[PDB]
Amino acid sequence: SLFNVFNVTGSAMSAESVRLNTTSSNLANADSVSSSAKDTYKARHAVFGAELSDTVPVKVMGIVESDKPLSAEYNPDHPLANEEGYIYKPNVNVMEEMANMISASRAYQTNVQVADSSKQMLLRTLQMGQ
């Protein structure tokens, strides 16, 4: 009630934090062949949501795996290969992970400014009539 801006800016901070964690996992598991062909790691992405029934908070609605086909590689030497000597690798694209890293960091720090400036307006309100 007295801190509506904080609940929205703070929600963005929590929302954008999850997207950076997801990006870190995608880049750290870009070369994890693992085993089989369906347990292989796939690029994960958070889903943001806004319920507009004032302020509309941003809520993460779960992590969703990418629909891109797995990157196939011919390697009849890896013991975890298949009949045709193929090892399927995660469908992680480095260029899109770099862009998400730039977008997440900048958007996260933008909400810091709004939340920090929101406190100043509250502090100035207490000085009304003084």
Binding site: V47, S66, M95, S103
Partner: peptide
Amino acid sequence: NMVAGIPGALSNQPPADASIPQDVA
């Protein structure tokens, strides 16, 4: 009523790329 989708690079490209799952899109 909600407005949900994957933010970032996966949604800011033409749909012909087809990276977002159909259900999510």
